[PDB]
Nucleic acid binder design. Structure first.
Lengths: 49, 76, 1352, 50, 174
DNA sequence: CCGCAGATTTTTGCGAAATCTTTGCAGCCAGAATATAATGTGTGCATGACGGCGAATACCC
DNA sequence: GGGTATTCGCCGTGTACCTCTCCTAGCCTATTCTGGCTGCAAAGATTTCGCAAAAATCTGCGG
RNA sequence: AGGUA
């Protein structure tokens, strides 16, 4: 149940933006500073941006 | 179609009670009971009210006096 | 259908809570799971809150409309309408009284302050940490005191059945019961008349004010402790079925379930006589649950099972951002609206916009039904629905009919100013996107790159008319923040106009003679001539002259063919000179402004549409294209780059030699690269500007280039000189992280592709720009929200009030030159004084009257230096402002109309440009740039034996009187200077009229004699650095930030005495002969040195500036409007008279001002880190500064007066705005200020408490009443106080407005405990209520209601 | 998306909802300010109540 | 503790015996899941219990607790679930206008009939008053309590059968 | 333009069934009753904006 | 006296779309007897619906 | 959640 919660409903588990091969490549290569253990959007916080 | 209301503002300088008086005129125009005084081009009551005020037929005073006289023939 | 003049908020009583309740919620049950019929008697209950489905008992007994006046008595369930379930409230009978969290953890704790008892003590008592005595007896135990477990046990053992003490909310409620308000009020009133001690009187006054306010509220303090808890109607906490095992349930439902569970458990435990620990635990349960329900978040959060998220509470549903959710935002959704992407509408007229057929059909479905049934094509609404969903051709004519006259509102996704919503006549178009008029996109700030706009349909006839009169685009051709038109040709049309008017040096058909521009158009269209060529054309220009009559003058003008073609478009009545020129954006904007001012509205709209069409057509015929060759690289780019590389290499080599410091080397390199960038840009602009060298008849000539990019650069269509500089030249210096300018700039441009590393460098600038745009947009939104809040209730209520007060109005000169003239700042204002001509005493401006362009021209002809203008701040009107004191600005040159809401338009005007805000020869020698009369203001100078006009004090100004009366150059003379010019001497331009050392301020003696050291200890105040060469020394007076243990007990000074020893005073100066040396005043002249008038006494070191100390943009504007301190307030001389020093350094040095007459003692504090500009024994006046540094608005208002603080705020904010090129009429800032100072502090009361922060309008009507009456009580005197916009909006008269857009919980608590009764008469109040606003169209209605109130 | 009648809400009556026909357009506080700036009273009342 | 979990932990009430049945179902589901190693198949669940299987699935539906609307739809979108829930207890304005037009048409048609026939019809079905009356109740007021009142009603119906008063009402019912 | 036929109106009659209350039944359900070995412990602490600001005790001079 | 000198909470944070449905967990957990409640089955009591059918009534036109 | 202004 917890593994399914991670893979399905999480800040870093997203529907693949699938309208281009480039879109898929970018989504799989994406790097997020957000998520569990990262940075909340309460930032700027200009340093990281 | 009435592109500008500046000529109407000239007759009624407040530009806000102008809306009230022309709205009263147009409502008496749409709701049955009153007949037009200016020719139309298959237009609704709004530009009719604008044209009537623009030529000086209708302002606050004319609407008020007319509602009196009509009140007197209906009471008879 | 509901009429009510006001809303009262007060403390809910348990009896009236039961009055609201229709039944007691006794069970936490909700429903029967499989059967979704609500349980009895649970949170959802038909027996309590009413039936679920329409007009039938939930037992299967009665199902009909007949059984509606009688409830079902055969079972618990009643039968009514189902909407009743949305309004019926319930109540829960709490076994133990429970404290209200809002009255507890608000920063002012109403329970705490009413009991005058600190917060920790209430927290410990309520949460069962300690006992508290609910009245004692004949004990040594006070009526109120907290006791711990062992202390309470010891008291109980020591004192028997006389000791009443409990624990928790029951104890708090018992305390509130035992406290009587009226009796304590009487006791305090008696004591005040008897007590004379200051502290005792202050305590009595505070307590009596608090208790009297509570009594006037008509509330009983026991009501703060909740005995019965109301429960919200179930429909407002809905439970709706959803597919699968998931069902939508309210967090309120779970919270009330928890509360009911804990209450029932407490009841059971009490019935079972449970041990004290358990019952205390369960009371803790109930208190925690009630606190979470009322406001979850101030108790260490509450989470539910199967869901990890803070539960929604009633406070959380009320408190929202931005503003109240359901009422205004987010978001007050609306019907009869659509949304779509926008496209250009280049064929449309200004008063109309393209609306797609499908959106028009869907929007107007009721109208289509009405007209179909009117002409009888459908016998029922259902048949009309079938017809419209079939979309037959029949309904389309009906649709055209209903659209023909109906105007629709177009709205941009963000709305920054009132132009964000504009009416247009919809025109049916096949397609799917809204076509928008190209001229209007500038107002919307909408670019066709996927922007979506919304369309609203004004339904009622009044709304249709209201949109046509006010919402219409043609009625809003002028910006509300400035008279110059907002519908200005922008980019493509400007380019077309420029190409049409710009002249060549040789083309087909030069030297021809033409009559009328019609021959010009014929020649151009036939290809017999060129669009631009010098031609003599006979044209009839019409001039508005005499009394408003057209004067036809027909003569020959030397112009171009394109210019004549344009003149064909120009309506009759304008001078031809306006078009006989190259036309940029500025030229076209000015031409439209002149057309509007001279002709009127309809000619302006027609001319704007025609110029749009002409510009588009001739831009298309232009074929203006940007290629790869139209960024011609300047030939000297490589040479300049190589040179600059050579000098920076030389500088780096010299840095290794240690000859130049790292900072100086960096500065030199930066300057070298800046010079190289400027040279490259200048060479590029020279190349592009006059690129055409073609011969006129064989003789080559240099004239304006046909280069396209130079056309878009020059016409101002898109891209400035800086923009083209990055394209054709070199993009130059930028910055790296930490915001420092990079040592090596980018030597490449976008035509010579940037290499990897330079692009990576530019990426930092790009990221910074984007993040700045985002953050500045958010900050601008917050700022404009605050401005709307403070300026919400302000509206023009009177045509005139009658007042000769105002502001002294002058063209502003900051630095050395004028940047904003008199005319622009006074245009559209009303006169407050009949100002005379600068020469003869002749009145050219009559009694207070509106100043239009003619009066401004008259004022320019007879240049008067200053004009008194009735500002809104000085208006005597209450509950609004008079029409004159505002001005004229709106969308017309006429005076403001009564009922117009100036507050909101001003707030929008100041807020909208917020997204545009992303932010030697000085102080050494004054150099007047022009030749004019020299005048000194507030000067203290006397000519000495050396002819030196030495100016003392830092409050002296040097103006420059022009030929008539106008100052055009103003400067500030610091303390100590040398001037070779007099008070009437003429000075040439660029001539050094004053001079002083840039390294130090010299104190030049104006008398003679020996220097005597007064208050000197060699080693405490001054330090020995004697370097006697001719009798000199480097004795250092320690800086006025820190001194020694003996330097803090004396004020070091230099007295000037003669040989006899008698005092020799300086003539013609307030300065005494005893120079009080400030910090770092290095005593060059030792004791016993003959000083000449013209010799330095003590130098004050400086740095000749070189450091930035000015900020602007959104934070600066916000701080100005919040009246923030500048972290170093420049204290002023707060009373006129002689000044003197006091006892030195009790930590902060005291300064005593004693006026020459009247109440003498005015000792005050001055901190010892300040740099004093005050000298003891001089005659100062109220307003003079005492210490250097920036000022704060508070003391400016308090001392210099209201007009002075208004002038300061206006000038400071306009300085920020003019820095970015945005112009705002100062009346907007004036009305914002007028809203900021709506509160005043009473000194002498009429019916107040001598310190009461009270609304000025009530104070003003009261003082008017007492003055007109024979009763001059008391009194009454007031002093206007300045509050920040957030504070002013927070402390308004209506609690609805304050609670809406600011701290909702605290405002609601304050209003409830005070029992406030807001009486509406405010835009946002009536918005929340849902009636006509008391502004504009609605002002007539409310004024009628005002007549219906207080009178039959 | 365009509507004249359709999805309302439970707790409030603000029209919104539906992936077939959506709600109306949010007439937020910005637009209310825009109307208040003019003498727009009846149109504002339509935006708010009717 | 079991009583507390059964009562105060479920948002909707679930009986204690039903809660025990749910717990048994979950335990047997876990047993079958770890034995078969794939999933709990409803057939084996039916086999283990005396419970048919439709009751099993309805119980499984019941065992799940309601969710808040304050949860974001779409994994932390700034919109909440309750912001999308349509009010199904509100009559559509289309239907309200249809009802008003139908009431007007029925009133006009009743006015098109005779006095006593229309009068009988008004109280027989409760037309244009907030009360409804039975056939015998109308007959008592018409001082005729016999087959005559129902014959008058049938005569009114037969008169309405004509395609001159039914055409206007024909549109409402398709 | 008037009297009977077609169409319309008048009048008496029987079957049908549904509904309201009462009685028997089955699934739902609540409390009352019985005596397995288990008490200082768990526990969630989830954590990187930014500016303003008064209230609440501390501490030097 | 007294003036900072810390720490201790509270508050504010752009607009408006769209796609997504993703929202949901342990299972460690004892037996039962008595009585009522509620949905449903069954029966007496009663009103309300249609044809039946003949008798009275309404309406068209030519001799 | 992602994307748009």
């Amino acid at each position: 149940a917890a593994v399914k919660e991670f893979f399905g409903s999480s800040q870093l588990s997203q529907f693949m933006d699938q309208n281009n091969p480039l879109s898929e490549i970018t989504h799989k290569r994406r790097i997020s500073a957000l998520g569990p253990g990262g940075l909340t959007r309460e930032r700027a916080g200009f340093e990281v941006r | 179609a009435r592109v500008t209301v500046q000529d109407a503002v000239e007759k009624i300088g407040n530009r806000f009670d102008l809306v009230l008086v022309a709205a009263r005129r147009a409502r008496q125009m749409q709701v049955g009971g009153k007949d037009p005084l200016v020719p139309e081009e298959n237009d609704k009551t709004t530009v009719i009210a604008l044209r009537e005020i623009e030529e000086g037929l209708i302002n606050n005073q004319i609407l008020d006096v007319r509602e009196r006289q009509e009140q007197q023939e209906q009471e008879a | 259908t509901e009429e009510f003049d006001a809303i009262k908020i007060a403390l809910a009583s348990p009896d009236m809570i039961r009055s609201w309740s229709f039944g007691e919620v006794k069970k936490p049950e909700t429903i029967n799971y499989r059967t979704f019929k609500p349980e009895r008697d649970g949170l959802f209950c038909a027996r309590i809150f009413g039936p679920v489905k329409d007009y039938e008992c939930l037992c299967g007994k009665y199902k009909r409309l007949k059984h509606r006046g009688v409830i079902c008595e055969k079972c618990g369930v009643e039968v009514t309408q189902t909407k009743v379930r949305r309004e019926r409230m319930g109540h829960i009978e709490l076994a133990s009284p429970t404290a209200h969290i809002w009255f507890l953890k608000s920063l002012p704790s109403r329970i705490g302050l009413l009991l005058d008892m600190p917060l920790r003590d209430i927290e410990r008592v309520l949460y069962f940490e300690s006992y508290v005595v609910i009245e004692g007896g004949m004990t040594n135990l006070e009526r109120q005191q907290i006791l711990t477990e062992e202390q309470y046990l010891d008291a109980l053992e020591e004192f028997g059945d006389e000791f009443d003490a409990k624990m928790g909310a029951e104890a708090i409620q018992a305390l509130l019961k035992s406290m009587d308000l009226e009796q304590e009020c009487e006791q305090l009133r008696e004591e005040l008349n008897e007590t004379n001690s200051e502290t005792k009187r202050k305590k009595l006054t505070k307590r009596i004010k608090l208790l009297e306010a509570f009594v006037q509220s008509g509330n009983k303090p026991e009501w703060m402790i909740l005995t019965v808890l109301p429960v919200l109607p179930p429909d407002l906490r809905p439970l709706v079925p959803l597919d699968g095992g998931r069902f939508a349930t309210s967090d309120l439902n779970d919270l009330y379930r928890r509360v009911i569970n804990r209450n029932n458990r407490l009841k059971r435990l009490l019935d079972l006589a449970a041990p004290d620990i358990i019952v205390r635990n369960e009371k803790r349960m109930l208190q925690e649950a009630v606190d979470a329900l009322l406001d979850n978040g101030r108790r260490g959060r509450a989470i539910t099972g199967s869901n990890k998220r803070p539960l929604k509470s009633l406070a959380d549903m009320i408190k929202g951002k931005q503003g109240r959710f359901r009422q205004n935002l987010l978001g007050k959704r609306v019907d009869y609206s659509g949304r779509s992407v926008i496209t250009v509408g280049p064929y449309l007229r200004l008063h109309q916009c393209g609306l797609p057929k499908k959106m028009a059909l869907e929007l107007f479905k009721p109208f289509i039904y009405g007209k179909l049934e009117l002409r009888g094509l459908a016998t029922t609404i259902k048949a009309a629905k079938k017809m419209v969903e079939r979309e037959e051709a029949v309904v389309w004519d009906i649709l055209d009919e209903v659209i023909r006259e109906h105007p629709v509102l177009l709205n941009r996704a963000p709305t920054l100013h009132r132009l964000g919503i504009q009416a247009f006549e919809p025109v049916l178009i096949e397609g799917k996107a809204i076509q928008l008029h190209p001229l209007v996109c500038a107002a919307y700030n909408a670019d066709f790159d996927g922007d979506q706009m919304a369309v609203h349909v004004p339904l009622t006839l009044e709304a249709q008319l209201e949109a046509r009169a006010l919402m219409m685009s043609t009625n809003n051709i002028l910006s509300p923040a400035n008279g110059e038109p907002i519908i200005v040709p922008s980019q493509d049309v400007v380019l077309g106009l420029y190409y049409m008017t710009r002249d060549c040096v040789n083309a087909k058909g030069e030297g021809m003679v033409l009559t009328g521009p019609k021959e010009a158009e014929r020649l151009y269209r036939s290809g017999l001539a060129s669009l631009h060529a010098r031609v003599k054309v006979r044209i009839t220009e019409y001039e508005k002259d005499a009394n408003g009559e057209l004067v036809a003058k027909t003569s020959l003008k030397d112009t171009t063919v394109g210019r004549a073609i344009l003149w064909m478009i120009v309506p009759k009545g304008l001078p031809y000179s306006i078009v006989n020129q190259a036309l940029g954006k500025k030229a076209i904007s000015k031409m439209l402004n002149t057309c509007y001012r001279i002709l009127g509205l309809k000619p302006t709209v027609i001319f704007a549409d025609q110029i749009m069409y002409t510009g588009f057509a001739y831009a298309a015929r232009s074929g203006a294209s940007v290629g790869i060759d139209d960024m011609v690289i300047p030939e000297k780019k490589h040479e300049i780059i190589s040179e600059a590389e050579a000098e920076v290499a030389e500088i780096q080599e010299q840095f290794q030699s240690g000859l130049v410091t790292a900072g100086e080397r960096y500065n030199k390199v930066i300057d070298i690269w800046a010079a190289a960038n400027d040279r490259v840009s200048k060479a590029m602009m020279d190349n592009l500007q006059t690129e055409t060298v073609i011969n006129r008849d064989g003789q080559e000539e240099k004239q304006v280039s046909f280069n396209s990019i130079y056309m878009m650069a020059d016409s101002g269509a898109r891209g400035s000189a800086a923009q083209i500089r990055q394209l054709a030249g070199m993009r130059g210096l930028m910055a790296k992280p930490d915001g420092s300018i990079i040592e090596t700039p980018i030597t490449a441009n976008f035509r010579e592709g940037l290499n990897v590393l330079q692009y990576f460098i530019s990426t930092h600038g790009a990221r910074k720009g984007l993040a700045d745009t985002a953050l500045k947009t958010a900050n601008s939104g917050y700022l404009t929200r605050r401005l709307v809040d403070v300026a919400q209730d302000l509206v023009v209520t009177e045509d005139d009030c009658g007042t000769h007060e105002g502001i002294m109005m002058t063209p502003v000169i900051e630095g050395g030159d004028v940047k904003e003239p008199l005319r622009d700042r006074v245009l559209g204002r009303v006169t407050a004084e009949d100002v005379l001509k600068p020469g003869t005493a002749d009145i050219l401006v009559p009694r207070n009257t509106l100043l239009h362009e003619q009066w401004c021209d008259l004022l320019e002809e007879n240049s008067v230096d200053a004009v008194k203008v009735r500002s809104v701040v000085s208006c005597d009107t209450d509950f609004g402002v008079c029409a004159h004191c505002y001005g004229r600005d709106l969308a017309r040159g006429h005076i403001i109309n009564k009922g117009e809401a100036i507050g909101v338009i001003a707030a929008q005007s100041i807020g909208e440009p917020g997204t545009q805000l992303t932010m030697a020869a000085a102080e050494s020698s004054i150099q007047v740039k022009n030749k004019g009369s020299i005048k000194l203001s507030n000067v203290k100078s006397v000519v000495n034996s050396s002819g030196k006009l030495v100016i003392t004090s830092r409050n002296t100004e040097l103006k420059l009187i022009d030929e008539f009366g106008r100052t055009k150059e103003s400067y500030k003379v610091p303390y100590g200077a040398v001037l070779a010019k007099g008070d009437g001497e003429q000075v040439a331009g660029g001539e050094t009229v004053a001079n002083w050392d840039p390294h130090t301020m010299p104190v030049i003696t104006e008398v003679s004699g020996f220097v005597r050291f007064t208050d000197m200890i060699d080693g405490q105040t001054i330090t020995r650095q004697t370097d006697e060469l001719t009798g000199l020394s480097s004795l250092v007076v320690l800086d006025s930030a820190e001194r020694t243990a003996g330097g803090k007990d004396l004020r070091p000074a230099l007295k000037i005495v003669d040989a006899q020893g008698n005092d020799v005073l300086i003539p013609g100066t307030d300065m005494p002969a005893q120079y009080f040396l400030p910090g770092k005043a290095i005593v060059q002249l030792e004791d016993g040195v003959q000083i000449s008038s013209g010799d330095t006494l003590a130098r004050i070191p400086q740095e000749s500036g070189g450091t930035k100390d000015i900020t602007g943009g959104l934070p600066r504007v916000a701080d100005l409007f919040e009246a923030r301190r500048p972290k170093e307030p420049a204290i002023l001389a707060e009373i006129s008279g002689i000044v003197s020093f006091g006892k030195e350094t009790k930590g902060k040095r005291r300064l005593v001002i004693t006026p020459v007459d009247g109440s003498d003692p005015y000792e005050e504090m001055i901190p010892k880190w300040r740099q004093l500009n005050v000298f003891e024994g001089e005659r100062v006046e109220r307003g003079d500064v005492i210490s250097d540094g920036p000022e704060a608005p508070h003391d400016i208002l308090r001392l210099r007066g209201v007009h002075a603080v208004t002038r300061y705020i206006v000038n400071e904010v306009q300085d920020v705005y003019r820095l970015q090129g945005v112009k705002i009429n100062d009346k907007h800032i004036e009305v914002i200020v007028r809203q900021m100072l709506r509160k005043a502090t009473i000194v002498n009361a009429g019916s107040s408490d001598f310190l009461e922060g009270e609304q000025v309008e009530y104070s003003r009507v009261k003082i008017a009443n007492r003055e007109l009456e024979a009763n001059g009580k008391v009194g009454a005197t007031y002093s206007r106080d300045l509050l920040g916009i957030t504070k002013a909006s927070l402390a308004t008269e209506s609690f609805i407005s304050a609670a809406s857009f600011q701290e909702t919980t605290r405002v609601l608590t304050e209003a409830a405990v005070a029992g406030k009764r807001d009486e509406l008469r405010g835009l946002k109040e009536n918005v929340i209520v849902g009636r006509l606003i008391p502004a504009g169209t609605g002002y007539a209605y409310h004024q009628d209601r005002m007549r219906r109130r207080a009178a039959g | 998306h365009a509507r004249s009648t359709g999805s309302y809400s439970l707790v409030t009556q603000q029209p919104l909802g539906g992936k077939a026909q959506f709600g109306g357009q949010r007439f937020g506080e910005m637009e209310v300010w825009a109307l208040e700036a003019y003498g727009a009273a009846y149109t504002l009342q339509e935006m708010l109540t009717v | 503790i079991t009583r507390s979990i059964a009562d105060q932990a479920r948002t909707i009430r679930i009986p204690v015996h039903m809660i025990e049945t749910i717990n048994k179902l979950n335990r047997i589901s876990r047993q079958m899941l770890q034995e078969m190693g794939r999933e709990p198949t409803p057939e084996e669940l039916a086999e283990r219990m005396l419970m048919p299987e439709d009751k099993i699935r309805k119980v499984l539906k019941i065992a799940k607790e309601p969710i808040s609307m304050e949860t974001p739809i779409g994994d932390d979108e700034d919109s909440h679930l309750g912001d999308f829930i349509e009010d199904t207890t509100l009559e559509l304005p289309l239907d309200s206008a249809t009802t008003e037009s139908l009431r007007a048409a029925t009133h006009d048609v009743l006015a098109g009939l005779t006095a006593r026939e229309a009068k009988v019809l008004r109280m027989r079905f409760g037309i244009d008053m907030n009360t409804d009356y039975t056939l015998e109740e109308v007959g008592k007021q018409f001082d005729v309590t016999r087959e005559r009142i129902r014959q008058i009603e049938a005569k009114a119906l037969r008169k309405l059968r004509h395609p001159s008063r039914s055409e206007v009402l024909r549109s409402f019912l398709d």
